[PDB]
Design a protein around this ligand. Structure first.
Ligand SMILES: Nc1ncnc2c1ncn2[C@@H]1O[C@H](COP(=O)(O)OP(=O)(O)O)[C@@H](O)[C@H]1O
Ligand SMILES: Nc1ncnc2c1ncn2[C@@H]1O[C@H](COP(=O)(O)OP(=O)(O)O)[C@@H](O)[C@H]1O
Ligand SMILES: Nc1ncnc2c1ncn2[C@@H]1O[C@H](COP(=O)(O)OP(=O)(O)O)[C@@H](O)[C@H]1O
Lengths: 740, 490
């Protein structure tokens, strides 16, 4: 009676607090259908009743349940539960629920008709006596406990059964936690980073006795870094609450705001107190305020505080039940005596979320906001490039406050204060988000972005041999390195795209980074010129370090000849080969870990002026010439660029291809965009004509770009590439294996 | 320890530093070990406070109060020798200096055997693979590697199989083997190697690898080994040894290979100084730390300093014309000043290298410095066959490969290009094998597994179309023009 009823809890994908999700092999093995009331027994003689639905991404021992039912059963994620199917009641008699005093503060009116009314409508959910569930609305989350269940111990929703529940807030029992706290569900983005932290602190915090039966040292120094406002303390609170370990919080300014001896005593007291209540986590945030760089300690008491922290961190190698996590802003901003083995040896980079992550955070913060239907969070998530989690929290709060300041406060004239049901009847518009996102939110980001890009192979037009070459060079090795070992060949860790300007080098590299499903760190030309002009070429190493903190990557050193082309080009400053930044790139590339899947890709428009020491073997050496596109590729270029715009049937892409030769793809995209510009101008003239009606439903502005626009904007087509350009490119080609 | 002394009050840190020495002197013979010395006694100008100087002076006067006693030894630990107060590194206080440094492949194998001594590995795990694939790891990283590998081998299974059971069973724990893939996972990700330092070790290429140049073998063997073996003959005849060679020749004919081979046979360390390093020291304009390199050489004696691409500074400074058009530069001057004023017999052998022998400043080949110029010639037929078979000696090759016809066909090609031909032929072989793997993977329903792991003649005869002469004729001609400026025809 052990085999079919043991599974392990994990995270959820669904949002309903009553659904539990199991994989298909187990549910056909368990003989279970959809909708069936099932019962879960967990730790401490606790129960949970649940409706079951089917999902895909699980194994045969994983159960996905939301945080509410997980806390209802008195178990935590990664532990085991016992699951038995029961028979159904399919009615109710008179249920009774009470609110909680800890969640209800300053709520006026009755909670019943506004919350519990719309909740149990057409969604058959089972409930048990003595549980805790949560309802969202009116920019709050309210807890309700079921006290009395008349017909069975467990009873499904059944709209004949009205709720009589007009009672006072009942005192929350003091051993159980609220569900408005933080957990793994309340962190948007950071899937990889939560994966690393969850696998790092699973064993020492969940299973403490295991580390008394082996001599193995688990990692005890974790350092979280990332831009400010990215919610690093939130991750620690979450991990603390989800493992159930004791959480102590030290902070930088509070330690530096006390007297000397008293700051020493608090730093000692924190460590000894947290060691008393093992297993624990000690979280020191704003680490760079309490322990900066050596030369940046102008005082004496600062060095005593740093040394006190050092000797306490070295007095922890005896204990295995304490983990210390700290938070900083950048790794080279704290004392290097801390970032050593035994003190702070694991480093985790939180970093900036992306479009999916920004969508995750916006769904977290508007979870109980009662948005309208027209608001499209995808638009916002695409239009918030450069915002971190705190800015999106400020965005949602500011949008709500805009949606409460322009109306329904100055309509509260006959009324004096806010009504509950009035507050619930607060929808937000897309224009409200356009207002909040347009002005008053300065994005706090000037940082390099590292993410998986979004252009794919269907976008670049043509160059299919280059596709089957890049796929080889990037994917072949990392997929299955056994063949390379049998034949003893080192992988190539570089390509050099050379060709005319604007034929799709960046597009190609972003596409090969997309298919490989790896990060993409782009280093522009202006950045290299900045590092040459300011003469601080040291921080180049930082970039590579960043690459190894986000592995796998595709470093893309665009405009690699810009330094040479700014230094007089062919003649100027004596006329040597190498420069500062390119030397530093060589020194950092040669001395890097020979297998990390970090793939360096160059780019250049003038392949001869680059210094010859870069294409020696062991560096980026597999030169690829990006050719000027031809007819069969020009048609693909043109249709791929037009694929986001309406186009009619009379557009002769064949004649367009045949007509335009020696034009780079950039110029064809200029032709497309300028044709769309003329189309836009024509439409605004049509809008002014039909706006200036005779008295002042024939609304259609003809949203179809006719042939006239293309055949007129084609007069503004300019050849950006001469003939001698192609000729010196062929002259560089003959200096390769083609004709030499 | 350093931080513990700096974390106390002033008088109490003074008392602990006194108490330690008197206590250890009471229980003679003893060792006093002060680790993190650079935290307790940094450089003079780096003591911004006053109490720091009193702590340094207290340590100094206690170390000078120890010349009476002979039963106490004081060992300290730092990170680099030029990071502590120079008043400590004097005779009577800290006079012996020992450099631990980074282990090598044999040493890394030693450390991995120490930490997996009671781990119950499986048979398929090959620690040689790991030891060759952990270039840049020191002992703490290998300890973290072994602990992380064990923790991976206990987190993915046999914890979530402990469902019916509650806690770990002894016999269950003993039945924990590790896989090579587990080590590949732990070694692939999550272990940033903590090394950007120059490596000093005995290299692994030997004389069997370089193809040809046997006169150069019997010359280098002379110049390096003859003196240090038995110096009595040099004393009877009164000739000072030559402490330098200058390999000049075309690019990519095996200069680095030759120097690494002569460092191998002599069984001495090999400190390599690249071209980018010289360019870094010229661009940052801190040419002082060149002396450090030489100091490092004398801490690891015997050595073979290999100053590769010695003309790169000149070739970056306009080459023939630019910046007035003088001879000397910063870093090359510093190399002269450090080479002239070094200990005339330590078995430290400086070896240069260059691809353009004329633009190097003439003050480097005056006697008493590196002066025994050796021209590395472009390889010929009897040496091309040796080059080709030595490079193919790690790869499967069939019988139909006509290395004689390969040699006769390719002339004026440097060994680097022939190795490029070999590696690109192996690349085409790899590509063909992956096409065979996709065909036989896409079976009719979806033991004839053999992917033909034998590089046929087709690969070589096809990749031979991509052979490119990296060296022109005028290159060889100006090399002969530099040759005639030597004793050959002048
Ligand atoms: N990934 C995320 N998921 C949810 N909320 C986030 C995320 N990133 C940031 N936030 C929000 O941004 C803020 C981060 O600021 P921080 O100083 O870290 O918080 P705290 O007030 O806990 O110190 C928090 O209010 C948090 O709600
Ligand atoms: N093959 C192609 N397919 C689709 N778009 C292309 C192609 N080639 C060029 N483009 C256009 O050119 C631009 C990219 O130019 P790019 O090659 O990055 O310039 P550069 O060569 O200066 O780096 C994009 O805006 C894109 O619209
Ligand atoms: N005689 C040789 N025997 C074996 N390999 C050689 C030989 N000559 C050159 N090579 C190849 O050339 C490369 C070494 O080039 P090297 O001479 O160091 O270049 P540089 O002259 O620029 O220092 C190695 O990869 C090696 O495979």
């Amino acid at each position: 009676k052990n085999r079919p009823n043991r599974l392990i809890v994990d995270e959820a994908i669904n949002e309903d607090n009553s659904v539990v999700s199991l994989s298909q092999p187990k549910m056909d093995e368990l003989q279970l259908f959809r909708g069936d009331t099932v019962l879960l027994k967990g730790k401490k003689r606790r129960e949970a009743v649940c409706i079951v639905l089917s999902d895909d991404a699980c194994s045969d021992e994983k159960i996905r349940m939301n945080r509410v039912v997980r806390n209802n059963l008195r178990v935590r994620l990664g532990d085991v539960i016992s699951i038995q199917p029961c028979p159904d009641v399919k009615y109710g008699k008179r249920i009774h629920v009470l609110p909680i005093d800890d969640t209800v503060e300053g709520i006026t009116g009755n909670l019943f008709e506004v919350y519990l009314k719309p909740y149990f409508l057409e969604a058959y959910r089972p409930i048990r006596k003595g549980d805790i569930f949560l309802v969202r609305g009116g920019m709050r989350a309210v807890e309700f406990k079921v006290v009395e269940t008349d017909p069975s111990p467990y009873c499904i929703v059944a709209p004949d059964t009205v709720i009589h529940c007009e009672g006072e807030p009942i005192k929350r029992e003091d051993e159980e936690e609220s569900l408005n706290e933080v957990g793994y569900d309340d962190i948007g983005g950071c899937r990889k980073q939560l994966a690393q932290i969850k696998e790092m602190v699973e064993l020492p915090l969940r299973h403490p006795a295991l580390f008394k039966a082996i001599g193995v040292k688990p990692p005890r120094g974790i350092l979280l870094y990332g831009p400010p406002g990215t919610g690093k303390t939130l991750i620690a609170r979450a991990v603390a609450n989800e493992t159930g370990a004791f959480f102590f919080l030290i902070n930088g300014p509070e330690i530096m705001s006390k007297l000397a001896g008293e700051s020493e005593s608090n730093l000692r007291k924190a460590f000894e107190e947290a060691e008393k209540n093992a297993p624990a986590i000690i979280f020191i945030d704003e680490l760079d305020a309490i322990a900066p760089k050596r030369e940046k300690t102008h005082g004496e008491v600062e060095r005593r505080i740093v040394s006190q922290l050092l000797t306490l961190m070295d007095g922890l190698k005896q204990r295995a039940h304490v983990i210390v996590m700290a938070a900083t802003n950048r790794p080279n901003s704290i004392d290097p005596a801390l970032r050593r083995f035994g003190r702070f040896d694991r480093e985790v980079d939180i970093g900036i979320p992306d479009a999916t992550g920004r969508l995750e955070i916006l769904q977290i913060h508007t979870k109980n906001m009662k948005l309208a239907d027209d608001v499209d969070l995808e638009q916002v998530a695409n239009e918030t490039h450069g915002h971190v989690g705190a800015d999106l929290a400020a965005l949602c709060s500011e949008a709500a406050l805009q949606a409460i300041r322009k109306k329904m406060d100055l309509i509260d004239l006959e009324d004096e204060t806010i009504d509950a049901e009035v507050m619930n009847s607060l929808a937000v518009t897309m224009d409200d988000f356009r207002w909040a996102l347009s002005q008053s939110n300065p994005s706090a980001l000037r940082e390099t972005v590292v993410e998986v890009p979004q252009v794919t192979w269907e976008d670049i037009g043509g160059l299919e041999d280059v596709k089957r070459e890049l796929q080889e060079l990037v994917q072949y090795p990392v997929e299955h390195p056994d063949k390379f070992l049998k034949f003893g060949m080192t992988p190539s860790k570089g390509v050099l795209f050379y060709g005319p300007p604007g034929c799709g080098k960046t597009l190609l590299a972003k596409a090969i980074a997309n298919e490989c499903q790896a990060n993409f760190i782009s280093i522009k030309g202006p950045e290299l010129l900045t590092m040459w002009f300011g003469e601080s070429e040291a921080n180049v190493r930082e970039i590579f370090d960043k690459a190894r903190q986000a592995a796998p990557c595709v470093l893309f050193f665009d405009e690699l000849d810009s330094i040479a082309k700014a230094r007089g080009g062919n003649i100027g400053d004596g006329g040597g080969a190498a420069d500062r930044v390119i030397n530093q790139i060589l020194t950092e590339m040669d001395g890097m870990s020979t297998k990390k899947n970090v793939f360096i890709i160059g780019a250049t428009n003038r392949p001869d002026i680059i210094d010859p020491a870069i294409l020696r073997p062991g560096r980026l050496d597999q030169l690829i010439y990006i050719p000027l596109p031809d007819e069969k590729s020009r048609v693909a270029i043109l249709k791929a660029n037009l694929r986001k715009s309406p186009v009619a049937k009379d557009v002769d892409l064949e004649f367009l291809a045949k007509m335009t030769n020696g034009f780079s793809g950039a110029d064809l995209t200029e032709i497309c965009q300028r044709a769309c510009k003329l189309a836009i101008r024509e439409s605004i003239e049509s809008e002014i004509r039909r706006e200036r009606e005779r008295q002042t439903e024939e609304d259609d502005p003809v949203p179809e770009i006719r042939r006239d626009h293309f055949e007129e904007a084609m007069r503004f087509a300019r050849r950006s590439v001469s003939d001698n350009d192609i000729r010196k490119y062929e002259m560089f080609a003959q200096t390769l294996q083609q004709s030499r």
